[PDB]
Amino acid sequence: VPGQEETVKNLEIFRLKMILRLLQISSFNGKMNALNEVNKVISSVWLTAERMAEWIQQNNILSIVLRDSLHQPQYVEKLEKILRFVIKEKALTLQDLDNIWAAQAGKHEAIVKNVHDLLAKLAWDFSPEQLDHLFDCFKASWTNASKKQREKLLELIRRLAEDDKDGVMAHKVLNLLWNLAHSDDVPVDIMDLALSAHIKILDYSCSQDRDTQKIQWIDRFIEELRTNDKWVIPALKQIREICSLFYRHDLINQLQHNHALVTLVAENLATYMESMRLYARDHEDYDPHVQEVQERLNFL
Known part of the structure; x- marks a missing residue:
């Protein structure tokens, strides 16, 4: 009937109401059935891309979904598509991402990686504001992170880089690796993991980005040690x-033309041997220091 227009929208909410209750059903069969029906209607999408995205938002559908249903990887994969739909018309909010990162707070090790799995696959479609807030959440987690929590953060962090189709998000990822590997508050066993992730990220992400940034990143690394604060x-x-990896035989010459490697390291040896001997007259009641001298000659 052409005249039944408000009726279609009246029932459309009614079916949407029934689906939401099906999500609210404690039965796992109902919740997965509900998502499949949600998965179908999104593909069909008078329900435009913004009305259903809004309908998910104020109803807090994902808030209920992320509470317990995340324990099954098969469910999250279906959940990925609708969350992509919510993102692509800019419907997810900052608090939604907070709930996404709240799923790893003290829960089982099983779901935390799936939360990492969904975020890594959702990373490309995230807006720069969403991406940086996630990085801010990582640093806040990094402050209270445990030994197992720190390494899987890097595992999540390195998941953010290799899938980066355009080398823009990788720059912020490398900044965190530079921050983490240079943060003295974090023990040494993370330091190598942070460095190693940086090594492979600069390795796997060749594409059109790798060598070009190499000179910039290697020079920045020299610039960081051009000041003596450990x-x-x-x-x-x-x-x-x-x-060792990044031509190489002429690269040493290229890095010796004006940013001389052998020459500059000589002062770094000199500028720290003096500093060590400054307190070696009053604080000599200590122990060797050896790692610092050993590594510096090893590089040369």
Whole structure:
């Protein structure tokens, strides 16, 4: 009937109401059936791309979904498509991402990686504001992170880089790796993991981005150790694996023309041997220091 227009929208909410209750059903069969029906209507999408996205928003559909249903990887994969739909018309909000990152707060190790799995696949469609807020959430998690929590954060962080189709998000990812590997508050066993992730991220992400940033990133690494505040120990070796992989025979000459590597390291040795001996007259009642001297000669 052509005249039954408000009737179609009246029932359309009624079916939407029934679906939401099906999500609210504690039965797992109902919730997966509800998502499949949600998965079908999104593909069909008078329900435009913004009305259903809004309908998910104020109803807090994902808030109920992420509570317990995340424990099954098969369910999350279906959940990925609708969340992509919510993102692509800019419907997800900051608090929604907070709930996404709240799913890893003290729960089982099973679901936390699936939350990482969904975010990594959702990373490309996230807006820059969404991406940086996630990085801010990572740093806040990093402050209270545990030993197992820190490594899987890097595992999540390295998941953000290899899938980066355009080398824009990778720049912020490398900034975190530079921040983390240079953050003295974090023990040494993470330091290598943060460095190693940077090594492979600069390795796997060749595409059209790798060597071009190499010179910039290797020079920035030299620049970091051009000031003596204990950045030298990580920065010097960080260069070493880069030079081992990233032409190489002329690269040493290219990095010796005006940013001389052998020459500059000589002062870094000199400028720290003096500093060590400054307190070696009053604080000599200590122990060797050896790692600092050993590594510096190793790089040279």
